[PDB]
From a paper:
The system of five interrelated, functional β-lactamases stems from the recombination of two homologs, the TEM-1 penicillinase and the PSE-4 carbenicillinase. We further expand this investigation to engineered enzyme variants by examining the same range of motions in a closely interrelated system composed of three recombined and functionally selected variants of TEM-1 and PSE-4, or ‘chimeras’.
Among 32 natural variants of TEM-1 characterized to date for substitutions at position 68 and 69, Met68 can be mutated to Ile and Met69 to Ile/Leu/Val; the substitutions Met68Leu and the Met69Thr in the engineered cTEM-2m and cTEM-19m do not have natural counterparts. The inclusion of 17 substitutions left cTEM-17m essentially unaltered relative to TEM-1, but inclusion of the substitutions Met68Leu/Met69Thr in cTEM-2m and cTEM-19m dropped kcat 1 to 3 orders of magnitude, to levels similar to PSE-4. Thus, the slow motions of TEM-1 were generally maintained while additional residues acquired ms conformational exchange.
Author numbering: 26 to 238, 240 to 252, 254 to 290
Amino acid sequence: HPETLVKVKDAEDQLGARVGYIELDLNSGKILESFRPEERFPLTSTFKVLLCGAVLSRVDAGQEQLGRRIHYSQNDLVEYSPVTEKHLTDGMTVRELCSAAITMSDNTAANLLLTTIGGPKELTAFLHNMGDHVTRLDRWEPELNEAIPNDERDTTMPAAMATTLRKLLTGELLTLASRQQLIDWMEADKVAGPLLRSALPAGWFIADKSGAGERGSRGIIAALGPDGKPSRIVVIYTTGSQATMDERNRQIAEIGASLIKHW
Ligand SMILES: [Cl-]
């Protein structure tokens, strides 16, 4: 709906910074609405979903096992590791790392998973290898969150991220089992409350991943829809703003309410 873009433009005005927006049909992949679809923004923690899509693709290919256990040490823990910091003794399985990376945005869990696939370069190669020549991961947690203005390291564009997410949730890229696990982890997201979830009416489905970093960077990727099933993908990114976190959350929640109102 073109009225949703009026709210997207208003978010830009309120944040004093760029906002990129894409709403996609889940079934056809068609772009329904877009704003700055081809401009780069920092991935921050939204890359965690792409990381576990690359992990799941290796599982599908018999090179990795969801039940494999990894052990690690205090020297591996970086900031914002609420789950991994609790399992130093027992270690965690690849499945439990993905869960922590997606549902809790656990940073050491992302680094551990990155090491399983050969680092940021290999994530970028996975994305390159599934048709996405835009999205790129260059660094590890936490430095990937730096959001230096005009730096293309650790960035995507709203349209590239939206079509990639759709290919991960729907294509024959991944087996049914893998596609269902990725979305089930997204649906279990615990750290994106004040964004699209705060505008979502009772009974609607949402599977999302949010991100926050430095210099006002903030974003969210989602599969959502009425009647307890996803029917659309939405991607929202912003960076640069000096507005506080509460105000960035509110602008994204208001984009979400406007999208719902105009569904
Ligand atoms: Cl490993």
